[PDB]
Design a protein around this ligand. Structure first.
Ligand SMILES: C=C(CC[C@@H](C)[C@H]1CC[C@H]2[C@@H]3CC=C4C[C@@H](O)CC[C@]4(C)[C@H]3CC[C@]12C)C(C)C
Ligand SMILES: C=C(CC[C@@H](C)[C@H]1CC[C@H]2[C@@H]3CC=C4C[C@@H](O)CC[C@]4(C)[C@H]3CC[C@]12C)C(C)C
Ligand SMILES: C=C(CC[C@@H](C)[C@H]1CC[C@H]2[C@@H]3CC=C4C[C@@H](O)CC[C@]4(C)[C@H]3CC[C@]12C)C(C)C
Ligand SMILES: C=C(CC[C@@H](C)[C@H]1CC[C@H]2[C@@H]3CC=C4C[C@@H](O)CC[C@]4(C)[C@H]3CC[C@]12C)C(C)C
Ligand SMILES: C=C(CC[C@@H](C)[C@H]1CC[C@H]2[C@@H]3CC=C4C[C@@H](O)CC[C@]4(C)[C@H]3CC[C@]12C)C(C)C
Ligand SMILES: C=C(CC[C@@H](C)[C@H]1CC[C@H]2[C@@H]3CC=C4C[C@@H](O)CC[C@]4(C)[C@H]3CC[C@]12C)C(C)C
Ligand SMILES: C=C(CC[C@@H](C)[C@H]1CC[C@H]2[C@@H]3CC=C4C[C@@H](O)CC[C@]4(C)[C@H]3CC[C@]12C)C(C)C
Ligand SMILES: C=C(CC[C@@H](C)[C@H]1CC[C@H]2[C@@H]3CC=C4C[C@@H](O)CC[C@]4(C)[C@H]3CC[C@]12C)C(C)C
Lengths: 375, 43, 405, 41, 41, 43, 375, 405
């Protein structure tokens, strides 16, 4: 029953157009309607906090960072790298998901979708150098559609010879890229379950969507959106499965794994955050809920886990380095009340969240002090 | 006064991986020390 | 109990057996031959801590050179050597001049060390009258010494007495109140610094229960017909928590009752038979968390004073069949120096735990090739975090530092 | 061992003890050198 | 006076005397603040 | 060894008005201190 | 009888052309003959040490800085700002003298002369921003010639509304610029003396050349090259004189004044450096020689005085801040022996040079320590 | 002399008159009434310095509570109060037990403080026999005390004696050699630490010259028929420089002569009539620069041992008609701590100068509303730089730090 400290809040999103002159030119045009801006993913690198927006009608830029400027809605966004990549007339159409690797490359999953459905352009995977803010490589996703159903690239994971993984919730499959082959996989574990299609604050026929790669085991955990199961596939395989079914009491939302082997996941029904340690066996008595809030955790659309910096390995024993960033929009409302707070980036120290619970990693209490970190 | 928000701000920079201002570092070092001095930490 | 089996606390000091800094191995051997120092008869009663000093008190059996000690820089095959405090002058009791058996210790806001000398030899034969000493820790010199009058040191009908527990309430650093439990005689002495007055209280809550007289620790068991001990004063509520040794209850008395004179109808509170086993020593954090040793389980339990005193608010926070066999003492300290502006960044409170093996003393059957006496420690907040014992966490800084020694 | 020095030093500070200036200086030297070698500057 | 503190402190150091940790800390604080105010960083 | 040429080099930078390397500053601080430690300056 | 510590030495000058390929292309061409490179002036700002070369035949660049690279001759030079300003076909022809002001502007006196005589282009005064390395202003010197004799701008001084002063040794006059008027002045004190035209290691009919502005008195000290006198003119005057005649026993070379009011000057005959405090009266018993060396001080072609940085006025009492940079070529040899050392930049702390001599400024001994600085 | 008229040295401590830390103004007044302390009769003989202590020795006239003192933290209207060293125990001479009149001091490599107690009262009447004390500065305790036998303390024919100068040669920190000038009796005592042996020497170089018996300081003049004083041992050459008080000469004796025994034909060196006025106290730097006070000019002069002893190598380095009237003492210290790697950055040596006004003592005509006694100081290298006295400067670093207190 923890609340997690808020890092950023919004009543609604707004952007740094330049002057209030240049904003009003966009409002009248319908380039920017505040009522249609919904965040898809967040991430963090140095001083930058990325926020991606689902490209509906009235969404000026998709790939953004939070700026120094502030509005009545909350922190204004600012397109990344510049406004050049905000344009789609198929030039980033809709930055669905983000990922940052060991080498300071930012991977972006552009779905190509408009209103999250009509595919105006083909999907692609971009790769920016965060040191320069310039683009290193762009690749079209052919892999991209079911080849039978015909059907939304809605999850991403990246492994400095790197390997990317892209879930397709609508088409129900797993694209596997090699740094230049692509390959679509399929499974019944990737398919949606009709039983858990209804997610009742107060229906979605989507499959594989909620991926999370363990840095310690190399299992890519996942589940269909309509499911109460937790499946996984080992990635050492990556030319053609594990996990329990119906293990959770409600549907899971986004997912993330710590370097230390703790899997976190959002619990849709309870409006809570749950965890599970990979060292334990996947069963009910090892699944615990670690935070919950009826106001603040309504749909956990994204989670990332970062390590405190700089990384000086000799001092690791003194520091609980890992912390979690949580995007909690209100997908249930996507009929909003824009006089209230709707979109939140929360955070917390990982170890503080699970300590003295079945989720914890074993504590060697071998120093007179331990420092817990977050932002 | 308002050493706490400076500290919070500075540590957040450091742990985030960001480059950290030498003047903010120097000033916060000055303020932490003075606080410690006034609390007889060295006396 | 959950999610905490075999969770041990980091060791600060270990011993196979106690030994002392006599000077050189010449001066030691002079004492071994004399019978002043037999290593097999040294059993620790209490610990405490102030600045660089860790106090260790020894039950004065035959072969125990000093009772009130500190841990020294020197080290032996047994473990850290002890060194009498203040000097060897207070180790002597042929004279019957100073300190026979430092049963318990307490340190107050003003850097005074309070010592409960029982006067017992072999924990039974009262060679001298009990007394309460008060040293100035800044100087290592004695400020005051007071005899505990036979009037209140023993039960009047039975004549029995063993002063086994101590707690101090420094109200104003100058009007302090001491509290001394008598487990054998079954009473609560209440001393006043202003008058040097004493007052012995009685209650059925101070009496031993025959039902829970058998206590099993690590296979071996023994029997103890003892009452009130394991005292602990809450700095936040002023409740002096206690229980009879042979009991599974947790009682308490509010001490505001003792402030206004004329009490000598006192009101005792607390649940009976609330624990599954007997409780041993006890301590309360400034933040209102009560810790207590669970004799049967060889565990440490807690309970927050903010919650209601019942089973569903009692949790066991550490347990170890090897390391926690009899928790004979516990103290809680705050990290120093105290810079209040930075309190928000620091979990300041930590716990020190003396865990001898009283079960092996009873039967006179120790294995001195093994580790027997341990001072463990831990950060209080880290021990109770995400458990029913915790205080509500304001997560308001990008970092939090947990401290112990 | 830098770790044993650190542990020893912090224990002194938090215990309320007087703290060795040489242990302070030497541990500051070792922490810095570690940070230097890790390109922290 | 920062100057009188500096003078006092250096005189201690060069004389072979034991040197006050508080005077050391406070003078370090004052030299730094001066440097900060002069945009030295 | 060769702390003297580092010192000389560093002070020359500072007095010349030049920007001064943080790593050279840190390393020279480390070396001066260690020398002082080995000369019982703190003992 | 002091020698002054050497900061840089040369047997002969050489440049950073790029590769030894690009050097050899210039040697063959006659763009760079090492035997014709003679330094005119030096200066210093942050990490840069400027070295100006008299533009004879075989001198690739005139305005240079010392580079990180090194040759058999000594430190290679590198044109400032880039090779763009090394070109003359009248685009810097010959950077005769330099000066740096409070605001980090570098003033350059381009004479326009080739072989120090034939005026290929008109003289000019350039002004670079040292923060950017870019040019702020360029101005042609009309003022530039005698208007009767017809005749070499060979000395410079700069006073953030700035005032520049340019001596003309051949034409015998003083140009005065206002930051945009110019104005040539004349005097018998600016004229050459035939008596001291011969400067005998083992004839020059030139006038005003050896200027030095006192930052404390605003006197611009000077003398004709052929003279043993020290004249001066106050600059508060600056629309149409002071100093003793025949006061020195031999001819003076370049000149410089400390902020503290000490005038330094090279003594041609003795191959020495002399001083004189402005607080004292200008006469023989107040003139002292402070350093001398038969090898190292043969012709003091330039001197500058800098203050140690950063400038933190509260700590001035602890620091002898001022130091002197001395260019000592061997103008007597301009028949060189290029297997020997010919051109030297020496330096020294000002206060250490004059302490306990008639040149010193009064010492308030009010601190347990005093730090002497140079490079 | 040139380029240095009225150049003064920074004052470290000033006095209008000396006063002591008796305890409180209660304890002072008890001594004033007694005649133990008259402020008008306190005249400083020597100064020295070790760590935080500045020693100040007082000529034991009537009304001089202690002879061997240090400057205290307390301050009076006269100036810094003095405080007896080690404690008041050594201030007493009714008993004749310890320290009558600490004439001169010396500190050696091993942190021993050597004291030359003359035994004189009013600088004439020998109330007790002279002695040489040796305290350990680390402990403030006395290591050894030795009487100077009447055999060598006085001239055998005339019987006169006044031990007025001291120098110490610590050869090995354990075999040290002390040297004690006797200005009245005209002799040089040479003591050996190994044997406790003494040997009195004589020479015409030790004798007073009637020609230069009149010495004028600041208008007022007096007359002094005194010989050998103003000694100073060179740490580099082992020459013990000296001169008779009534003389304008600078003599010396090499001390390697005294190393090999059997001397008691000794060879004395140095120019005669080389100065225009009389020299007062003397000191030599480790670097080989001899400093000396010039009585007539009220100046400080120097001479480098590397140069030849003659007029053109003697320069006057400071002078002041107010502040330098009689240079009664000089010492040279090196800045600390000693970190040899950084020696190149630091002019380490500095000079301490006691400048009382002996001219005003002679005539018993002081003005105690004025400043009378001064401890000045300066960096050695800064004082002699660009003068004939300097040692050659290697200018090999971008910075050089000059030190004094
Ligand atoms: C209590 C404090 C401040 C404590 C400060 C010095 C702590 C806080 C966080 C620490 C960094 C955390 C992680 C890390 C990651 C590790 O890899 C290097 C150290 C570093 C940067 C810590 C350094 C020390 C920090 C800044 C004041 C109020 C007296
Ligand atoms: C600017 C910083 C670093 C702040 C650092 C230099 C401060 C913090 C606390 C200080 C110690 C506290 C107590 C003590 C106890 C005292 O006995 C010695 C100093 C010491 C260890 C302080 C030294 C300096 C410390 C570590 C952060 C915010 C990036
Ligand atoms: C992580 C580190 C070193 C961290 C150091 C600066 C931390 C640790 C403990 C801190 C004190 C804890 C309590 C306290 C109690 C509080 O009252 C004052 C701050 C103080 C002394 C902290 C100061 C900062 C300390 C010493 C290295 C290895 C990179
Ligand atoms: C001796 C100490 C105190 C250790 C202190 C001075 C260490 C610890 C961490 C260091 C910072 C790490 C990162 C950083 C971030 C980097 O950008 C600037 C230096 C700084 C702040 C380090 C400086 C020195 C710190 C604060 C303890 C053990 C008692
Ligand atoms: C307390 C002290 C020591 C004072 C020391 C820490 C001060 C003095 C000068 C400072 C540097 C000035 C310039 C600079 C140049 C700038 O670029 C970096 C800081 C530095 C090196 C300052 C840092 C702190 C210094 C060395 C004395 C009085 C006993
Ligand atoms: C990196 C630097 C700055 C070096 C500084 C921090 C060093 C130098 C000497 C140190 C003091 C020496 C003695 C002592 C005496 C000792 O008792 C206390 C420390 C102190 C004052 C040292 C502290 C630190 C000092 C000032 C320069 C080269 C840019
Ligand atoms: C003796 C030392 C090093 C002493 C160091 C700390 C000295 C040397 C020069 C000083 C700067 C000179 C001028 C100045 C100009 C003044 O405006 C600010 C201080 C500064 C930068 C001095 C700071 C202190 C410095 C760097 C070691 C070997 C123990
Ligand atoms: C200019 C400064 C402060 C300069 C400080 C760091 C300087 C001054 C004296 C130096 C010591 C002198 C001798 C010595 C003797 C030598 O044996 C060790 C260095 C030491 C202690 C110097 C250390 C550096 C000191 C303290 C501020 C005001 C900007």
């Amino acid at each position: 029953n923890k609340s997690l400290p808020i890092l950023h809040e919004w009543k609604f999103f707004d952007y740094d157009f330049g002057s209030d002159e240049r904003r009003q030119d966009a409002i009248l045009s319908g380039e920017y309607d505040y009522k249609n801006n919904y965040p898809s993913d967040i991430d963090q690198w140095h001083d930058k906090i990325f926020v991606t927006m689902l490209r509906y009608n009235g969404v000026p830029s998709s790939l953004n960072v939070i700026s120094k400027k502030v509005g009545d809605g909350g922190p204004l966004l600012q397109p990344y790298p510049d406004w050049s990549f905000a344009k789609y007339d198929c030039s980033i159409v809709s930055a669905s998901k983000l990922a940052i690797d060991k080498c300071d490359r930012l991977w972006v999953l552009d779905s190509g979708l408009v209103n999250n459905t009509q595919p105006m352009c083909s999907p692609k995977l971009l790769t920016f150098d965060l040191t320069t803010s310039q683009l290193l490589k762009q690749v079209e996703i052919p892999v991209a559609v079911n080849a039978t159903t015909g059907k939304r690239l809605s999850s991403l994971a990246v492994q400095c010879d790197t390997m990317v993984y892209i879930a397709d919730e609508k088409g129900e499959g797993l694209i596997v890229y090699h740094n230049d082959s692509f390959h679509r996989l399929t499974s019944n574990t990737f398919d949606y379950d009709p039983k858990f299609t209804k997610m009742t604050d107060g229906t979605a026929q989507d499959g594989i969507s909620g991926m999370a790669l363990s840095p310690m085991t190399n299992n890519l955990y996942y589940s269909p959106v309509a499911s109460t199961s937790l499946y996984y596939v080992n990635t050492e395989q990556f030319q053609q499965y594990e996990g329990v079914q119906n293990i959770l009491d409600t549907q899971s939302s986004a997912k993330v794994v710590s370097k230390s082997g703790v899997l976190f996941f959002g619990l849709v029904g309870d409006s809570a955050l749950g965890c599970w340690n990979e060292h334990r066996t996947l069963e009910r008595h090892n699944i615990r809920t670690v935070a919950q809030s009826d106001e603040t955790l309504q749909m956990i659309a994204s989670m990332k886990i970062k390590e405190a910096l700089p990384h000086v390995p000799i001092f690791d024993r003194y520091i609980n380095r890992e912390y979690i960033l949580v995007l909690s929009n209100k997908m249930q409302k996507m009929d909003f009340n824009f006089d209230d707070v709707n979109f939140r980036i929360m955070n917390a120290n990982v170890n503080e969240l699970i300590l003295n619970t079945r989720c914890e990693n074993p504590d060697n209490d071998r120093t007179p002090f331990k420092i817990s970190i977050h932002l | 006064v308002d050493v706490v928000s400076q500290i919070n701000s500075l540590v957040s920079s450091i742990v985030s991986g960001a480059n950290v201002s030498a003047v903010l570092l120097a000033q916060t070092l000055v303020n932490i020390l003075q606080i410690l001095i006034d609390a007889n930490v060295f006396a």
